[PDB]
Amino acid sequence: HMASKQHAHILSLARSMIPPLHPKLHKGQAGRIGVLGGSGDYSGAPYFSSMGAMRFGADLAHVICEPSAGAVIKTYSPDLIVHTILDPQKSREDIRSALKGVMSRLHVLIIGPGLGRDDHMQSCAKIAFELAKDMEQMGVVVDADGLWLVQNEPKVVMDWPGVPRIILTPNVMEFKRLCDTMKINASGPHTSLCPQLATALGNATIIQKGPSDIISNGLKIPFALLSESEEEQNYLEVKVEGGLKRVGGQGDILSGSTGVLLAWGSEWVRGTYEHVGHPPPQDKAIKENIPVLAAYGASTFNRTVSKRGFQKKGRSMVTGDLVDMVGEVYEEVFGNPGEVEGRGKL
Amino acid sequence: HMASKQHAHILSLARSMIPPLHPKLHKGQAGRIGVLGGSGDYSGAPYFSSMGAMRFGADLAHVICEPSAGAVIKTYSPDLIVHTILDPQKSREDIRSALKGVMSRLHVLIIGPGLGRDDHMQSCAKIAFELAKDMEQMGVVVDADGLWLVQNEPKVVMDWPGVPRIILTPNVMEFKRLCDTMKINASGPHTSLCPQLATALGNATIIQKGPSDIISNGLKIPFALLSESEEEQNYLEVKVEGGLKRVGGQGDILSGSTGVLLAWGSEWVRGTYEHVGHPPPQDKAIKENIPVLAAYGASTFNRTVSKRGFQKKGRSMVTGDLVDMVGEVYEEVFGNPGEVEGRGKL
Ligand code: NA
């Protein structure tokens, strides 16, 4: 009853973030997304995240990776811009300098897909975190072994300037490790753990991936989003049915679409889309909660694309099948409803 | 008459091994499969086996190979996890250590596709055999030049701990060589050679590939499987019609699907699927004969996918065409019959 009303309401707020396809927009204004990862043999995950982002709607998707992984990733698609700049035969300052150059052309950096845990790549991600901190209009999505870095040095996300702009997407074990680091007692109420962790990490937005996804920034969900004399819940729960085939890169589809929605919503609040009929929202609660809306919309989208792929492929489904279906499922969840709602060609 | 009854019966037992697609299962529980091979120029076979396994239904398929072959294999699919750890510029203990790390995350290792006969790769396979022996819940499928190693050192399969968990898939010449090594007289009754060889190799399960496939572990096929006052046959014969176009990697499709069925059946007997409605079988004969059931189901499947590909492509068919058809033929042989039998979404 009220749960489907609330789900539809929050999804419509996420849809409000999406710029119209419009003659006055030029290349880049609908999102420049980067993926930092691709170490050694781990070249699938950064492809799934970056190509997922491109098929979802980024104008430009970049991969920032090691040379060996980058050579493979480039063969998967000429549309990806692959920067093989995380060369372990390069000085740390030379890597900082190259990373800063690429990052200065990004709206959002997804840290983690194929990152691994070795010292070189963990240092590269830490440099990326440090640079993104000081680029006040940069958003960050952190996944996979990017979250290994956060659990080892939580300060890399704590105390950032500008609007909040960080989304973490831990699986079950990554979530447990983050909770352990931040002294969050596992015996607490199940739906209170993610809000406590987000609070402990400075109100970053966290997608606690699970049978359902629990999404929180540790703050009550303001009246603009959550649906009496009681306080608004401090978490949202996505129970959208996904598919049953567990593909290895499902989480990279999530991070890529999360990054795009984060970029769109952040540019929206900044005013970039005002001249094409999408002015920023009046409500400051919406501005403060862009990462929650991006996370909620991406979680919803990710489950739906998993479901639609599974309906098509069944037991045989692999993550690569989902990449081909991102576009048609985007039209289902966001594009056609938004156009019919009068938001323009979404 | 009774032959089609028996074929249908044994296939239904193999279908009983397959876990349901189910919300309570998570990534990995429906099979982590590895392929050890890919030496020098021989990168097609390990792709066909690992991608065959993924399209058949493994959650995760890994390739363990040399760097040069691995670089090519990665370009074929971002969904394969390719470990380029069999570097001949690496110490033997460093290779043992890397192999153990990867193998500790596998249910089944398929040794042989693109392995070759050179000293380095034969040693890598022997290390893999030694490690798998001591990982009591690991299954092994041995094909192609993996069987060259067995004919040179048969003890690598003899006297293993745990449930039986080895399947050999020799072609005609590999079968003749194994028989020669184990002193099996070629003048014996044709259907007695495979049971004698399996017995000599410690009741490993052997798929004697041929016009028909003769499958044996050297033991009588227990009452749970084989269909009076006479003893149950000690071999099964798959006469399922295959296609007529001899593609180079047909045997890799077989080994990949064999590995998946072996993983499913082994986890099934272990109890992993009890909580989703597939408890282990009551009959200990079924538990002891998982490798025979996996071999029988895979042999059946392999012929059917060859037939269906040939119906579609005729003279032009190549192995790559079969990879694309694994999913639809799995639904034909296993998925839809099993669902209609009430086993859940298979
Ligand atoms: Na290619």
Named by the residue before each, gaps in chain B exceeding 2.5 A from C to N are 227
Under DSSP, the state recorded for A280 is: P
Instruction: Count how many Cα atoms sit within 13 Å of the Cα of residue B204 in the half-sphere of its side chain.
Output: 28
Q: Please report where in the chains the tokens 């590995």 appear, as a residue.
A: B259
CB atoms within 10 A of CB A47: 34
- Burial of B49 per CB tally in 10 Å (0-12, 13-18, 19+): buried
Contacting residues for B25 by C-beta, under 8 A, at least 6 apart: A244, A246, B19, B276
**CB-CB contact of A290 with A263 (8 Å):** no
Query: Which distant-in-sequence residues (6+ apart) come within 8 Å of B120 by Cβ?
Result: B39, B86, B88
Size of interface A-B (CB pairs under 8 A): 80
**Which of B259, B296, B322 is CA-nearest to residue B59?**
B259
Point out which residues pair with B33 in neighbouring strands.
B61, B108
A316 contacts on B by Cβ (under 8 Å) = 55-57, 326-328, 330
Q: How far is CA B187 from CA A175, B196, B278, in A?
A: 64, 12, 45
Backbone angles phi, psi at B242, to 5 degrees: -100, -175
| Tokens 């060259």 found at | B148
Six-digit token string for B188: 């014996």
- Judging contacts by C-beta atoms under 8 Å, the chain B residues touching residue A172 are 26
Buried b (16+ CB within 10 A) or exposed e, A69-85: bbbbbbbbbeebbbbbb
Return the structure tokens found at A149.
């870095």
Integer Cα distance of A338 and A342 in angstroms: 7
Contact B285, B134 (CB under 8 A): no
**Closest by Cα among A28, A101, A8, A9 to A263:** A28
Interface test with B, best of A41, A76, A212, A252 (most B CBs within 10 A): A41
Q: What are phi and psi of B297, to 5 degrees?
A: -65, -40
Per-domain boundaries in chain B = 1-346
Q: How far is the CA of A42 from the centre of ligand 1 (A)?
A: 17
Breaks (C-N over 2.5 A) in chain A follow: 227
B330 close contact with A: CB closer than 8 A: yes
Q: How was this structure determined?
A: X-ray
Distances (CA, A) of B260 to B294, B301, B306, B341: 8, 12, 18, 21
A328: part of which helix (H) or strand (E)?
A: helix A319-330
Task: Select from B75, B90, B325, B329 the residue whose CB has the most chain A CBs within 10 Å, as the one to mutate to test that interface.
Answer: B75
Task: Please calculate the CA angle B69-B72-B74 and round it to the nearest 5 degrees.
Answer: 110
Across chain A, the runs of DSSP E, i.e. the strands, are 32-36, 60-64, 81-83, 108-111, 139-142, 166-168, 205-208, 213-216, 236-238
Question: For residues B204 and B182, is the Cβ–Cβ distance under 8 A?
Answer: no
Q: Is A44 within 8 Å of chain B by CB?
A: yes
Nearest residue of chain B to residue A246 (CA atoms) = B27
Q: Ligand 1 centroid to B315 CA: how many Å? A: 25
A319 CB within 8 Å of a chain B CB: yes
Residue A273 makes CB contacts below 8 A (sequence gap 6+) with A19, A20, A267, A279
Please tell me whether residue A49 adopts helix, strand or coil conformation: helix
Taking each helix axis from N to C end, the angle separating A290-313 and A250-270, rounded to the nearest 10 degrees, works out to 140
Q: Give B27's contacts in chain A (Cβ within 8 Å).
A: 246-248, 250
Token digits for B31?
């099979």
Angle between helices A67-76 and A44-56 (to 10 degrees): 40
Cβ neighbours for B296, distance < 8 A, ≥ 6 positions apart = B10, B11, B14, B215, B236, B238
The answer to whether B245 and B315 are in contact (CB under 8 A) is: yes
**Resolution (Å units):** 1.9
A-contacting residues in B 63-82 (Cβ below 8 Å): 70-71, 74-75, 77-82
Q: For residues A298 and A53, what is the distance between their CA atoms, to the nearest angstrom?
A: 11
